[PDB]
């Protein structure tokens, strides 16, 4: 229900449930109907039977790991520098040993990484100090790589979701956020009547849907970004389907009531019945039977797990090394025979 011009005459009239009740086609409105000033000037509302507010729906996309390859922490320049430095150190160690071979290269490789095959240690004092410094440098490099990877993983979190109605992303509409509505309800009236909300109302006017179900379905897909329908319905939808969540806090407190005409001999009796039902516990039973039950709860966003993205690169390199070894075994055997 909402007051609008007929586009044909200068007389404005209600539409929907409010119009039907005023037109005399119905004597009561038993359905979710928020109590507001605009609709209270024409009909009579009984005492609320369900207190609620306004919330926002969110898709809550599952987190994913941004890491792509094991070379992310170090640029190719650093890899080349270390590759050349290991050879330089091996050559220097070999020269020092000779003056005062593959053994030096094996030792350098086994000290840099943890191969454990670089047997043979230098005996000269200078060679000993060089080996100690090389081991320290390798340890520092490994520690720095691990620390950088840990820092990157810790600081890898999904973008923050909307928090309430005061979020700057909502106050400044763009071409990405939608946050549509039903296009004819208490929400539309509330957003139109607001003084410092013209931008939001103008942005939502071009994307409002026709029913709550369509808006929820669009939100479940990638066509809609947010929904501001209500709280008693959004919470139930989130509980039933944990694919969506409710964000923010209620910003328009109201309640559902029974709509009736101004001159109706049922207002007092209906209000007393509602109060008695609230007091005795009938409303609690109804809520437990129809609302107070869920299927899947919610879980605070936890750190992501390394998927096959981590495998990509590392196992590719392992396979490449195996292929290179299989290709070079024949060449090595031929060279040994020759």
């Amino acid at each position: 229900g909402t007051q609008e011009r007929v586009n044909n005459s200068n007389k404005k009239e209600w539409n929907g449930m409010m119009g039907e009740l005023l037109s005399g086609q119905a004597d009561m409105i038993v359905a979710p109907l928020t109590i507001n000033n605009e609709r209270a000037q024409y009909i009579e509302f009984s005492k609320p039977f369900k207190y609620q507010g306004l919330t926002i729906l969110v898709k809550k996309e599952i987190p994913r790991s941004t890491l792509d390859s094991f070379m992310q922490p170090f640029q190719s320049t650093l890899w080349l520098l270390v590759g050349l430095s290991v050879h330089v150190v091996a050559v220097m160690l070999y020269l020092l040993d000779r003056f005062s071979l593959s053994s030096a290269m094996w030792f350098s490789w086994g000290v840099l990484l943890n191969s454990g095959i670089g047997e043979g240690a230098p005996r000269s004092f200078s060679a000993r100090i060089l080996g100690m410094v090389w081991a320290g440098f390798a340890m520092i490099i490994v520690a720095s790589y691990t620390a950088n990877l840990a820092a990157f993983l810790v600081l890898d979190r999904p973008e923050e979701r909307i928090t309430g109605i005061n979020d700057p992303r909502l106050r400044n509409p763009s071409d990405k956020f939608i946050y549509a509505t039903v296009k004819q309800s208490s929400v539309d009236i509330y957003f139109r009547r607001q003084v410092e909300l013209s931008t939001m109302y103008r942005h939502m006017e071009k994307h409002n849907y026709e029913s709550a179900a369509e808006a929820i379905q669009a939100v479940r897909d990638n066509k809609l970004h947010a929904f501001i329908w209500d709280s008693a319905v959004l919470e139930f939808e989130a509980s039933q389907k944990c694919d969506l969540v409710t964000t923010g806090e209620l910003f328009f407190r109201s309640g559902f009531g029974i709509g009736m005409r101004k001159d109706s001999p049922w207002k007092q009796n209906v209000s007393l019945s509602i109060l008695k039902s609230h007091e005795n516990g009938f409303m609690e039973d109804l809520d437990k039977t129809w609302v107070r039950y869920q299927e899947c709860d919610s879980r605070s966003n936890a750190p992501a797990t390394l998927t096959f993205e981590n495998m990509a690169g590392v196992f590719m390199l392992v396979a490449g090394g195996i292929v290179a070894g299989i290709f070079l075994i024949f060449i090595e055997i031929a060279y040994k025979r020759h």
Binding site: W106, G116, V154, H278, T305, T307, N310, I326
Partner: protein, 236 residues
């Protein structure tokens, strides 16, 4: 409010099961390839190579005997590089997994076994309320077992109930929603929390009392509705 610890299985969180199985199959394939390549006192065996690879994977702590082959050394070096990368990634992921926040039990509210069947549970839930009030009469009229159970937890005084809850002498305090919210908004720290507004039993509101048939009722109701619609209610 509680704190929350880390899950017992968190040590397996960093890597998915598929990653572990792929790593095991790759290790087996590498060991077989190395054994085959070794053909071209300490006789080499497939079991010895598998043991060496397994030991060198985690931290090559266990003693192993390196192969005498040429390409075997390159294979071992590549495996060691892969193992170091894997260990660094696992440590980083485990460090990232240790950041955990607080949580709330999220009680349904006067509708779960906690307030209905405490005996068939851990040590019985200690929930109480201030006696000699409307809440006690409402509970007695609507429930009997809960009232009898709570009769032994009569916490006299809102401040006394809060102190008992803070010290652990009580598990839950049942009272008025507005008063509980106001107290939770001023308690030291943030230990005390209140249930969600959507799970309140016997909901009602605060209003203005007028004459039996006074003509100002409609004007007052319209003014209150206008205040609600404008938005001054949130500011207040």
């Amino acid at each position: 409010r509680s704190n929350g610890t880390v899950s017992p299985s968190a040590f397996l969180e960093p890597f998915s099961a598929d990653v572990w199985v792929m790593m095991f199959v790759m290790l087996l394939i590498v060991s077989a390839v190395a054994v085959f390549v070794f053909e071209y006192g300490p006789s080499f065996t497939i079991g010895k190579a598998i043991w060496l690879l397994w030991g060198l994977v985690f931290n090559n702590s266990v003693p192993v005997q390196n192969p005498k082959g040429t390409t075997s050394k390159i294979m071992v070096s590549v495996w060691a590089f892969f193992a170091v990368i894997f260990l660094a990634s696992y440590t980083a992921n485990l460090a990232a997994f240790m950041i955990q926040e607080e949580y709330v039990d999220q009680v349904s509210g006067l509708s779960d076994k906690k307030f209905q069947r405490p005996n068939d549970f851990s040590p019985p839930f200690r929930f109480g309320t201030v006696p000699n009030g409307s809440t006690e009469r409402n509970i007695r009229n609507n429930y009997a077992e809960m009232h009898a159970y709570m009769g032994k937890f009569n916490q006299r005084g809102v401040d006394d109930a809060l102190l008992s809850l803070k010290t652990g002498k009580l598990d839950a305090f049942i009272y008025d929603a507005a008063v509980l919210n106001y107290m939770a908004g001023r308690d030291e720290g943030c230990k005390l929390v209140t249930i969600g507004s959507g799970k309140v039993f016997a909901s009602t509101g605060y209003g203005i009392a007028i004459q039996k048939d006074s003509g100002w009722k409609r004007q007052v109701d319209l003014a209150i509705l206008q205040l609600f619609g404008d938005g001054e209610m949130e500011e207040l």
